[PDB]
Design an enzyme around this catalytic site. Structure first.
Site, PDB file in Angstrom:
ATOM      1  N   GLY A  22       0.812  -1.200   0.000  1.00 40.02           N
ATOM      2  CA  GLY A  22       0.000   0.000   0.000  1.00 40.02           C
ATOM      3  C   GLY A  22       0.851   1.257   0.000  1.00 40.02           C
ATOM      4  N   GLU A  23       0.170   2.402   0.138  1.00 41.70           N
ATOM      5  CA  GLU A  23       0.837   3.699   0.095  1.00 41.70           C
ATOM      6  C   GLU A  23       0.591   4.497   1.372  1.00 41.70           C
ATOM      7  OE1 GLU A  23       2.939   5.306  -2.340  1.00 41.70           O
ATOM      8  OE2 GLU A  23       3.119   3.289  -3.204  1.00 41.70           O
ATOM      9  N   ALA A  25       1.830   8.217   3.524  1.00 40.69           N
ATOM     10  CA  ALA A  25       1.659   9.627   3.203  1.00 40.69           C
ATOM     11  C   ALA A  25       2.927  10.281   2.689  1.00 40.69           C
ATOM     12  CB  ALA A  25       1.172  10.402   4.424  1.00 40.69           C
ATOM     13  N   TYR A  26       4.109   9.803   3.113  1.00 41.75           N
ATOM     14  CA  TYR A  26       5.361  10.189   2.463  1.00 41.75           C
ATOM     15  C   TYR A  26       6.024   8.979   1.809  1.00 41.75           C
ATOM     16  CZ  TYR A  26       4.426  14.178   5.515  1.00 41.75           C
ATOM     17  OH  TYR A  26       3.811  15.221   6.151  1.00 41.75           O
ATOM     18  N   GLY A  27       5.243   7.945   1.485  1.00 39.15           N
ATOM     19  CA  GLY A  27       5.775   6.923   0.600  1.00 39.15           C
ATOM     20  C   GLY A  27       5.078   5.574   0.735  1.00 39.15           C
ATOM     21  N   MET A  28       5.845   4.545   0.401  1.00 39.72           N
ATOM     22  CA  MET A  28       5.400   3.181   0.179  1.00 39.72           C
ATOM     23  C   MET A  28       5.430   2.363   1.471  1.00 39.72           C
ATOM     24  SD  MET A  28       7.505   0.501  -2.254  1.00 39.72           S
ATOM     25  CE  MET A  28       7.127   1.538  -3.658  1.00 39.72           C
ATOM     26  N   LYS A  44       7.196   1.009   6.544  1.00 41.06           N
ATOM     27  CA  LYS A  44       6.800   2.206   5.820  1.00 41.06           C
ATOM     28  C   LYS A  44       8.030   3.072   5.541  1.00 41.06           C
ATOM     29  CE  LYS A  44       4.924   4.950   9.892  1.00 41.06           C
ATOM     30  NZ  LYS A  44       3.622   4.662  10.708  1.00 41.06           N
ATOM     31  N   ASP A 139      -6.623  12.308  13.878  1.00 38.78           N
ATOM     32  CA  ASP A 139      -6.994  11.823  12.559  1.00 38.78           C
ATOM     33  C   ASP A 139      -7.483  10.378  12.662  1.00 38.78           C
ATOM     34  OD1 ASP A 139      -7.529  12.083   9.832  1.00 38.78           O
ATOM     35  OD2 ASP A 139      -5.484  11.544   9.243  1.00 38.78           O
TER      36      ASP A 139
END
Ligand SMILES: *[C@H]1CC(=O)[C@@H](O)[C@@H](O)CCCCc2cc(OCOCC)cc(O)c2C(=O)O[C@@H](C)C1
EC number: 2.7.11.24
Length: 346
Positions: A22-23, A25-28, A44, A139
């Site tokens: 998956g992805e 927020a600043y990468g993979m 991550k 969040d």
């Protein structure tokens, strides 16, 4: 270094046999085998250093999670980065590999009342610890709730968290953007910076509603549409709740609206447990001062099968003051990130 989908994923040699997941927020995000602990892990990749705001989010998550230890919060097992600041371009955070998250589950799986009760208990148990640290998550949403194969729940992503600051929470009308839209409390749009613990309780209420029907309860189409959805179900606020809002632009907007009736929860959710709808009503209270707090929620009859205050721990070392990360240039923030991650070398 090992590549994944054409991007450097430089984690070895301890972590091997990578797989895309998956992805972030600043990468993979990838799964991998940990050759030391002999279990598969989630990893991550973070690439924040070109931007001050990305560095802030990265530092904030590391400082919090390196302090927290809790069954319902996904911890940091390891951090991988270059040995020197000069060579450090990316940072990789290693965490437990979970099976799914609540967003993916709600796409296809109906929850039994017993699963809703257990999930909600775990969310509140984790939230209690966070709030006891004087921290706001800010969040909470289904995709930040991970589940393993036996439905143990852990809360993901402290990159948006803040130290609670109720005395400096008031602000103006339609100026704040805290949390993800469908899970954002009405007072965010009205007069609140999102610096009080009630912000998180609202999001949990939104999560519970969604667990009950597999549909987001307040599906606003854009920032300004969200309050329409909240008011269309809660109805018009009382005079007492409007007298709570001293800001005139906010109060007058609400006063300018036609009267709307409350939609009864049991009409929205005719399948739902009545104790769940009672708790739901208390979390989705318009007035944040009247909204239920995390310890009251744990004590609600709906959760009676699980509730055990002696098994609902709080934080040893609460965060006393703001981190003071704003205004720090990204060069300083990189150096802080470097310093905070030193304990995982070599
Ligand atoms: C937490 C946030 C999160 O889950 C979402 O933002 C998500 O879309 C990010 C990408 C996927 C995260 C993920 C996915 C997993 O799938 C597992 O498949 C093999 C069993 C498992 C885990 O554990 C995670 C995860 O840990 O996440 C964290 C890093 C971010």
């Amino acid at each position: 270094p090992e590549m994944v989908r054409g991007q450097v994923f430089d984690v070895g040699p301890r972590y091997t046999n990578l797989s895309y997941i998956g992805e972030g927020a600043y990468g993979m995000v990838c799964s991998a085998y940990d050759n030391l602990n002999k279990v598969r892990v989630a990893i991550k990749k973070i690439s924040p250093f070109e931007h001050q705001t990305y560095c802030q989010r990265t530092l904030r998550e590391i400082k919090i999670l390196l302090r927290f230890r809790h069954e319902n919060i996904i911890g940091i097992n390891d951090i991988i980065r270059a040995p020197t600041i000069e060579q450090m371009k990316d940072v990789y955070i290693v965490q437990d590999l979970m099976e799914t998250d609540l967003y993916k589950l709600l796409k296809t799986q109906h929850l039994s009342n017993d699963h809703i009760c257990y999930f909600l208990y775990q969310i509140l148990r984790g939230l209690k610890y966070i709030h006891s640290a004087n921290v706001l998550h800010r969040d909470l949403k289904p995709s930040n709730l991970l589940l393993n194969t036996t439905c143990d729940l852990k809360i993901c992503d402290f990159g948006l968290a803040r130290v609670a600051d109720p005395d400096h929470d008031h602000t103006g009308f339609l100026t704040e953007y805290v949390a993800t839209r469908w899970y954002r409390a009405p007072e965010i749009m009205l007069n609140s910076k999102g610096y009080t613990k009630s912000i998180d309780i609202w999001s949990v209420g939104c999560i519970l509603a969604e667990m009950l029907s597999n549909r987001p309860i307040f599906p606003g189409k854009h920032y300004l549409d969200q309050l329409n959805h909240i008011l269309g179900i809660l109805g018009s606020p009382s005079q007492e709740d409007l007298n709570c809002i001293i800001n005139l632009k906010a109060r007058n907007y609400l006063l300018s609206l036609p009267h709307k009736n409350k939609v009864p929860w049991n009409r929205l959710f005719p399948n739902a447990d009545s104790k769940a709808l009672d708790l739901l009503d208390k979390m989705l209270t318009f007035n944040p001062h009247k909204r239920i707090e995390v310890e009251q929620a744990l004590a609600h009859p709906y959760l009676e099968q699980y509730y055990d205050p002696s098994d609902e721990p709080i934080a040893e070392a609460p965060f006393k003051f703001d981190m003071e990360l704003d205004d720090l240039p990204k060069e300083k923030l990189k150096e802080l990130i470097f310093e905070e991650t030193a304990r995982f070398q070599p």
